[PDB]
Amino acid sequence: MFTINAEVRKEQGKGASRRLRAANKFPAIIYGGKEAPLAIELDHDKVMNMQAKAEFYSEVLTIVVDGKEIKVKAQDVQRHPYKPKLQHIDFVRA
Amino acid sequence: DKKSARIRRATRARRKLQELGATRLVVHRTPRHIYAQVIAPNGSEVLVAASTVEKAIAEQLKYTGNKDAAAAVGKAVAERALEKGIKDVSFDRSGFQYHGRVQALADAAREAGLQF
Amino acid sequence: RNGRDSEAKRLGVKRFGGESVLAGSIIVRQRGTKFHAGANVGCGRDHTLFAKADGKVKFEVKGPKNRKFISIEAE
Amino acid sequence: MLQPKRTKFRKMHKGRNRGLAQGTDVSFGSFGLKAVGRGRLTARQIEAARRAMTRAVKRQGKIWIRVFPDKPITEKPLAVRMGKGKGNVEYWVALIQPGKVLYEMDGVPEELAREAFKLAAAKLPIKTTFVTKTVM
Amino acid sequence: AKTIKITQTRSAIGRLPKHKATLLGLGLRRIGHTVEREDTPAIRGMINAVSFMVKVEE
RNA sequence: GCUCAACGGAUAAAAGGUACUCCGGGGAUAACAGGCUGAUACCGCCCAAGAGUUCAUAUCGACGGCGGUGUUUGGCACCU
RNA sequence: UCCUCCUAAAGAGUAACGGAGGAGCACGAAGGUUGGCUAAUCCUGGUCGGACAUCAGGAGGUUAGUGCAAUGGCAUAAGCC
RNA sequence: ACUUACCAACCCGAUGCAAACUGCGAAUACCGGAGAAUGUUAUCACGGGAGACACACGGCGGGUGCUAACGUCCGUCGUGAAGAGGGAAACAACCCAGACCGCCAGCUAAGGUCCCAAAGUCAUGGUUAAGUGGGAAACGAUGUGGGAAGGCCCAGAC
RNA sequence: GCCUGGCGGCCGUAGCGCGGUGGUCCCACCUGACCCCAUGCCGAACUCAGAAGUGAAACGCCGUAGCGCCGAUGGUAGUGUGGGGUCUCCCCAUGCGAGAGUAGGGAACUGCCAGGCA
C-alpha cells in the first residue's frame, strides 16, 4: 500500500552517492525478474518514516519512477552504522 | 580403487614424457584385450593404433588377452608405425608392470623395428 | 631474550611475464615450489626455477590443483 | 573481568583503530547499547557496566556482552627508562569503532532497557546510544 | 592537429618527483608559461596527472 | 691444524685501583636548575551501588568514567 | 656469528636493549635409481587387553609425515616400504 | 543398579577479534614491451678530484612510548641543512614561492581590505549575543535558528 | 546418429549426496593357478592361463539442486593525486574500486583414435 516516488540516478559511484545523501536522499536499486536493474534515488525522510512500520518489509510496495509503477518488495537495506538513517535499499520486483 | 591406483602409478612417467616431448606408445592391458596406440608429443592426437578388438588382429588369434595376442599387437603397431614414418618412440607402460604381456608387446615392437 | 633475525635471502620473481631471457637465467628464486616448472624451465636443487631455453617468460595456471606453472615461449 | 583463557602470543603491537564496526544490528536480544565514539574498552569497564545493568533490571532479563577484550596492553613501570624491551601486560582492552553494539538485553520493557543502558553507559569512555532490534 | 594549449599555474617546488617529471614532459618551465602541444591521449594523461597546477585551454 | 664465539679474526702471549691524580675534548653525554610531556602526584567534576534507624546526593561515597594544574616520583636529553 | 616468522607500508631491501623461536649437526644410508604403497584421529567387533600395544571393518580426509626451529613446499609425493 | 537446581566435549545455527590466521583481495608501487610529445644526454661505462658516513622537522605507513614528548627507531615524500622573498604577531623545518643586476612600472600566489598597516568600514541571504569569535572534556540545561514526524484538541485539549 | 574403451584439452557452472538404468560388443567383478611372476603370511594385491556366471559391487549414462561451486547490478570498505577539518580520526574534488551479501546461474563442455549397434 506504500507509494514511493523515485527518480532515476544519472550518476553513480561513491562520489555521487555521498553527494546524494548530503542532499537528504539515498540511492537504491530495483533488480529481479528478467529486466535490467534500475538505479533509483529516493527521498530519505519519507522512506525512513515509512520503514518505521513493519509492513514495509513484508507487503508489496509500489515505486513510482518516471510516471510508471513498479510493484517491488524490499529485499535488503544497508543502514548507516551509528545514525538513524539509510544508506541504500535493494528492492526485488514482485 | 584399482583403476585409480593404476593411473597414479602411470602419472609420473606420463608427465615426464610430456615434459621431454617424445611420441609415446601407450599400452593398455585388460583381462581379455590389449590395446596399443602411438600418441603425438602434444598428447592430444593419435597416429597409429592396434589392438585385439580389431578383427584384422583377432581372427588370426586363439585368444585375445594372452602373450601371443600381445605379441601380435606389438608387431602390428610396429608395422603400421613404420609405414607412417614414425621410427623412435618412448614406451609408456601406462601403470602396468613391464612384465607379462606388456613386455611381450614391447619386445615384439622392438623386434619389428620400432626404436625404443 | 630476543633480538635476532637472519639475513634477508632475496627471494622472489627475478624475471616477470613477457620478459625476454637467455638460457640459464633464474626466473623465480623461491623456497618451496610455490611456482612450478613448465615448458623449457628447470627447477634447481633449492627450487630455483631457471630458463632452460631462450624466449619469453610465461606465467600460467594449470592442472587440477590450480598450480602456477612458468613456461618459456621460444623467441 | 574478561580475558582470553589462553593466548597465542603474550604481547600485541598497538596498531590503529580505523573504520566502522561489524557487529551493528541487535542480533541476539531486543534492545542494544551501541557505540558511537571510537575509543577502546578495558575489561574493568565492561565489568562495571555489566554490573550496573544487572543490578538495574534485576535478575530478570537476559544480557549479552557482544564485545570481548582479547588485546593485551602493556605498560612500563614507574622510574624505568625507555628501551630495554617491551613493557608488561597490564590489562586487556577491546577496540571499539562507531557502530558496535556493545551490549544487548531482552526480557524487559523498553523503559528499563533505557534505564539500565543509561546507568551503564556512564561507566564507559565512549559516546553511546540506544538501539532496538530492527527487522531487516 | 587540434593542438591544445597548456599553462602552468602553480609552482613546482614541493612537488613529487613524478609531477616535476611530468611538467618537464609537457615542457613547462615557470608559472604562466603557455605551451602548445598535440591533443593525444598521452598528452591528456600528462595534463591529468598535474591538473592541479596546469590550466588547459582549447 | 682456531668457542681466532668480541664469529671481516688487532698479539703466539695480558687483570685491577686512583678521593694523590693528570691532559685533550664534549653540553655529541649524566648529576643541579630551566624546557617539552603529564604516566605518576595533587586538585576538581560525571554515574550512582551502598553506609547514614527511614532517606543514594546533611556527610561519606564502591565498581567505573572525564578533566585541570605544573606543586611530587618520573620520561626525554633541547640550553649550559 | 648463522637460520625461520612478524615488524616490513602486496617486487627486493629496511631499524630499535622490538615481538617469538632455533643452529655450531646428523646420515655410507636417512645418498642414487628402479618397482610399489598412502596418513592422523574417531567409531564398531574382538583372548589375555586396560583410556591408549595387535587383528578386522567403517567414518575421515592429510587435521599425518617430513633426522632436528619456523616458514614456504610436497600425492607425479619431497611422506612410507 | 536408582535420582539430580551443576559443568561440559563434538556437531549444528547465529556473533565478534588477530603483527607472527587466510578457502578472498584492491589502490599504489615495481619489473618488462610498444608508441607520441617534451627535456641543454637528463642515461650508462671508464678515468682525475672530492666531500660525507652527528642530521632536523613536517605529511603519509608503522615499531617503541602512555596512539606522552620539540621522545626514540624505521619506510617514503617535502622543506631546512645549503634558500633569500611574502604570509602565519614575533617563529630553521608550516603555507606561497625558488633572489644574475638595475627601474619612485604592471599582474598575481598564500594571506588579506575599520585604525596601527597596502587594499571592501563591498553587495545579497542567514546565524550567535556568549566578546562566542579570540584555549579545554565527560556530563548538565524550557538559550536559540532550521527539518521531518507523532499524542491530545473548539463532542473544548494544556 | 547411439553406446563403450584409450589418450588429451579444461580444472568444482566440471565435485559431492539421493534416485533410476546398462551389458550383443566393451568394461568390471569373475574362473583357475603346476607353470612367467608375487606375498616381510596369504594368487587379497601383482602376474599368468581362461570365460562358465552376474551386472551385486565397481564404472558409465540418465534424472533430482540437499550441499559444495560460479555469480552480476547497486551500495559499502579501502586507496593514488590535490585540497580541508573539530586532525590518535575523518571530510571534499577526482581516478581506481573490493571482500562479504543479494537476484540469479548451475548437476559440465570438448578434440583425436578404436570397437560394437542401427
PDB file of C-alpha atoms (C1' of nucleotides) in Angstrom, chain D residues 44-45 48 51 55 78-82 119 122-125, chain F residues 39-40 47-50 63-66 73-77:
ATOM      1  CA  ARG D  44      37.075  -3.329  34.024  1.00  0.00           C
ATOM      2  CA  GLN D  45      34.796  -1.004  32.161  1.00  0.00           C
ATOM      3  CA  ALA D  48      31.496  -2.197  35.678  1.00  0.00           C
ATOM      4  CA  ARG D  51      27.098  -4.816  36.975  1.00  0.00           C
ATOM      5  CA  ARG D  55      21.677  -4.529  39.151  1.00  0.00           C
ATOM      6  CA  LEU D  78      57.468   3.974  37.044  1.00  0.00           C
ATOM      7  CA  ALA D  79      61.088   5.254  37.020  1.00  0.00           C
ATOM      8  CA  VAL D  80      62.071   2.909  34.227  1.00  0.00           C
ATOM      9  CA  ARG D  81      63.888   4.353  31.223  1.00  0.00           C
ATOM     10  CA  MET D  82      62.851   3.955  27.623  1.00  0.00           C
ATOM     11  CA  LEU D 119      23.128   3.605  34.131  1.00  0.00           C
ATOM     12  CA  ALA D 122      28.173   6.240  32.360  1.00  0.00           C
ATOM     13  CA  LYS D 123      30.816   3.651  33.183  1.00  0.00           C
ATOM     14  CA  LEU D 124      32.257   3.550  29.606  1.00  0.00           C
ATOM     15  CA  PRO D 125      34.562   6.053  27.965  1.00  0.00           C
TER      16      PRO D 125
ATOM     17  C1'   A F  39      52.389   8.141  33.195  1.00  0.00           C
ATOM     18  C1'   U F  40      52.569   9.184  38.336  1.00  0.00           C
ATOM     19  C1'   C F  47      27.318   7.940  37.110  1.00  0.00           C
ATOM     20  C1'   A F  48      25.337   6.335  41.454  1.00  0.00           C
ATOM     21  C1'   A F  49      25.646   0.554  44.337  1.00  0.00           C
ATOM     22  C1'   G F  50      25.551   1.398  49.090  1.00  0.00           C
ATOM     23  C1'   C F  63      32.647  -0.509  40.666  1.00  0.00           C
ATOM     24  C1'   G F  64      33.829   2.622  36.686  1.00  0.00           C
ATOM     25  C1'   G F  65      34.277   7.482  33.743  1.00  0.00           C
ATOM     26  C1'   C F  66      36.109  12.790  32.259  1.00  0.00           C
ATOM     27  C1'   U F  73      58.097  10.489  41.567  1.00  0.00           C
ATOM     28  C1'   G F  74      59.377  10.135  36.561  1.00  0.00           C
ATOM     29  C1'   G F  75      60.341  10.168  30.956  1.00  0.00           C
ATOM     30  C1'   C F  76      63.234  12.781  27.045  1.00  0.00           C
ATOM     31  C1'   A F  77      68.191  14.732  26.615  1.00  0.00           C
TER      32        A F  77
END
